[PDB]
Amino acid sequence: XXXXXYFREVSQMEIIFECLVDKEEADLESTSIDSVEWANIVVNVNTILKDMLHVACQYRQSKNSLYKNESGIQEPEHVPWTASSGTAGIRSVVTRQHGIILKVYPQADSGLRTILIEQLAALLNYLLDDYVTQLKSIDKLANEERYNILEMEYAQKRSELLSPLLILGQYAWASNLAEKYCDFDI
Numbered sequence: 001x002x003x004x005x006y007f008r009e010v011s012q013m014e015i016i017f018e019c020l021v022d023k024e025e026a027d028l029e030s031t032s033i034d035s036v037e038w039a040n041i042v043v044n045v046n047t048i049l050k051d052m053l054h055v056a057c058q059y060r061q062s063k064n065s066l067y068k069n070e071s072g073i074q075e076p077e078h079v080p081w082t083a084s085s086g087t088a089g090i091r092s093v094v095t096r097q098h099g100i101i102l103k104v105y106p107q108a109d110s111g112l113r114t115i116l117i118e119q120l121a122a123l124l125n126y127l128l129d130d131y132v133t134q135l136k137s138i139d140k141l142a143n144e145e146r147y148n149i150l151e152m153e154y155a156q157k158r159s160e161l162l163s164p165l166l167i168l169g170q171y172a173w174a175s176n177l178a179e180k181y182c183d184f185d186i
Contacts, residue, residue, distance in 0.1 A: 014049050014096045021045045021103070033109035043114070046100050046121050053085060053128050060086040084131035097125050101165060116170060123173045126162045127180035133158070134181065160186055 006013065021042050028038030061080050063069035069081045087093075101122050107115045133155040140148045159181055166174055178184035 010052075011090065011093050014052075015092045017045055017049070018096045018099055022099075025103075025106075030106055036110075039106040039110050039114065042103060042106060043118050043121065046103075046118065046125070049096075049100065050121050050124050053125070056085045056087070057083050057128065060084070082131060082135065083128075084135040085128060086135055087132040089132055089136055094129070097129055100125060101162070104165060119166070119170050120173065123166070123170075123177060127177060130155075130159060130162070130177070130181035159184065 024041060025038065028035050028041075030038050061069070061083065062072060063081075064073060066074070071077055071079055071081060104118070104122070107118055110118075133151075137148070137152060137155060140151075162177065163174070163184070163186065166177065
C-alpha cells in the first residue's frame with residue numbers, strides 16, 4: 001500500500017510478518033510431517049527477517065567514528081569489529097525473535113536438511129540477539145549497577161535457554177554460539 005512510513009516503522013514488519021506466519025501456520029494443517037510447503041513458508045519468512053537484520057548489522061559495521069570501529073574508514077576493512085547491530089533491544093522485535101525461535105515444532109517432522117537450515121537461520125538470529133545484548137551491556141556505566149546486573153542476569157537467563165532449544169539440536173553450531181556470545185560456559 002505504502003512504504004514512506006513503513007520505512008520509519010520497519011521494526012513492526014517483524015512483529016507483523018511473524019504473527020502472519022503464525023496465522024498462516026494456523027491454516028497450514030501441519031499436524032504431522034504432512035505439510036511441506038507450509039514449513040517452507042515459515043523458513044522463508046525467518047530467512048527474510050534474518051537477512052534484514054544482517055543488513056542492519058552491515059549498516060552498523062560500516063561506521064564512521066575514529067576510535068569506535070575505526071576499521072573500514074582509515075584502516076583496512078578486512079578485520080571488522082563486533083557484528084552487533086547496535087540495536088537497543090525493543091521488547092517487540094525481541095519478542096518477535098524469541099517467537100521465531102520457539103516456532104521450532106515443525107522441525108520435529110521435516111526434511112533432514114530443512115531442520116539444519118532452519119536451525120542455522122534461527123542460530124543466526126540468536127547470534128545477533130546476543131551481540132546486541134552484549135553491546136547494550138558493555139555500553140553501561142558503573143553507575144546504576146543494580147539494573148546493570150539485572151540486565152546481565154536477564155541476558156544470562158536467555159543464553160541459558162537458547163542453549164536449551166539447541167540442547168538436543170545441532171552440536172556443530174553450539175560452538176558457534178559459544179564464540180558469538182563468547183563465554184557460554186554453562
